[PDB]
């Protein structure tokens, strides 16, 4: 339901006797004749106001329907759903942004896979400009805030319910080193939800930043070393990183 980068032709309209089905039939047929769309987005905000904005080479795709979205926050740091629910008795007015950052049933939804590939300034509409070269006195210092994991410890289940935020990271912008560096810096921005950040490659277009809590279950036996227990993830990633624990003095509980 969000892209953070890349939005072409926001055909803003509504249904007044028609329905949102034909809106899906509208902007799907718009992506059968050019190269300058790879997916599109389909919104709704309390009825009526719908968007078919088209996607041309996004950087990421963030904030799944199947993640953890209750830090008890709205309208201020609510960059994850994208909507800002205001209460100046506002209640009617539609407003649109540049990353479907809507200022207002909520059915926001997105599509993918034109199997893209282009040429520099040939069939050229959206280029990944200002790629933000991060300073190694800042980018090279966050990589020692974390720690790699030997992948023999993690076992797979695919069956234990584990809440997690997910991301796409398409390969045309992000390199192999920048795939980690965005995902590891994203783990710092969630100060208490992220303990495991992984990067996997299940198909040949993207990367995948999946943020986890501490998925280290342990059995009932009371032994000293932690060798008797391990990690559980739904799939075996290519890389895995722990936000290593930063314990601070002046304890915040009276046990």
Partner 1 sequence: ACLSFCQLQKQQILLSGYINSTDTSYLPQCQDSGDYAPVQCDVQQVQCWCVDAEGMEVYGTRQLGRPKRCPRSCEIRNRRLLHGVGDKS
Note the residues at the interface with partner 1 (CB under 8 A): 250-254
Q: Are 166 and 205 in contact (CB under 8 A)?
A: no
250 interface partner picked from partner 1, ligand NAG, none, CB below 5 to 8 A per type: partner 1
CB of 69 to partner 1, least distance (A): 21
Min dist. Cβ of residue 72 to ligand NAG (A):
12
How many beta carbons lie within 10 A of that of residue 252, not counting itself? 5
Report if residue 74 touches ligand NAG, rule: CB under 6 A: no
Measured from the CB atom, the residue of 47 and 124 that comes closer to ligand NAG is 47
Q: Report 38-57 residues binding ligand NAG (CB under 6 A).
A: none
The answer to whether 76 contacts ligand NAG (rule: CB under 6 A) is: yes
Distance CA 112, CA 31 (A): 11
Residues 58/5, Cβ–Cβ less than 8 Å: yes
The yes or no reply on residue 158 touching ligand NAG (CB under 6 A) is: yes
Structure tokens given for 8: 């072409």
Closer to ligand NAG at the Cβ: 17 or 117? 17
Q: Quick one: tokens of 232?
A: 């559980």
Question: Which 3-state string (H, E, C) describes 190-233?
Answer: CCCCCCEEEECCCCCCCCCEEEECCCCCCCCCCCCCHHHCCEEE
> CA–CA separation, 192 vs 122, rounded Å?
45
Smallest distance, ligand NAG to C-beta of residue 182, A = 20
Place of tokens 């290593």: 244
Question: Does residue 93 touch ligand NAG according to CB under 6 A?
Answer: no
Q: Which is nearer to ligand NAG, 19 or 225 (CB)?
A: 19
* Candidate residues 18, 28, 74, 176; the one interacting with ligand NAG per rule CB under 6 A: 18
Is residue 192 at the binding interface for ligand NAG, with CB under 6 A as the rule?
no
Residues between 216 and 255 that touch ligand NAG (CB under 6 A): none
Decide if 240 contacts 232 (C-beta within 8 A).
Answer: no
CA distance between the termini of the chain? 42
> Under the rule (CB under 6 A), what is the footprint of ligand NAG?
18-19, 76-77, 158-159
């Amino acid at each position: 339901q969000n892209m953070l980068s890349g939005l072409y032709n926001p055909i803003v309209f509504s249904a007044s006797g028609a329905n949102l089905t034909d809106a899906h039939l509208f902007c799907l047929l718009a992506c059968d004749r050019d190269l300058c769309c790879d997916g599109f987005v389909l919104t709704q905000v309390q009825g009526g106001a719908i968007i078919c904005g088209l996607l041309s080479s996004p950087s990421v795709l963030l904030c799944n329907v199947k993640d953890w979205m209750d830090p008890s926050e709205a309208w201020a740091n609510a960059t994850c759903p994208g909507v800002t629910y205001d209460q100046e008795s506002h209640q009617v007015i539609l407003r649109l942004g540049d990353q479907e950052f809507i200022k207002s049933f909520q059915q926001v939804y997105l599509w993918k896979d034109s199997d893209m590939g282009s040429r520099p300034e040939s069939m050229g509409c959206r280029k990944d400009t200002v790629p933000r070269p991060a300073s190694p006195t800042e980018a090279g210092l966050t990589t020692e805030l974390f720690s790699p994991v030997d992948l023999n410890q993690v076992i797979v289940n695919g069956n234990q319910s584990l809440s997690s935020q997910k991301h796409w990271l398409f390969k045309h912008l992000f390199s192999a080193q920048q795939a980690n560096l965005w995902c590891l810096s994203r783990c710092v921005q969630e100060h208490s939800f992220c303990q495991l950040a992984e990067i996997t490659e299940s198909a040949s277009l993207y990367f995948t930043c999946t943020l986890y809590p501490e998925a280290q279950v342990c059995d009932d036996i009371m032994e000293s070393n932690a060798q008797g227990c391990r990690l559980i993830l739904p799939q075996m990633p290519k890389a895995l990183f722990r936000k290593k624990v930063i314990l601070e003095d002046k304890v915040k509980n009276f046990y």
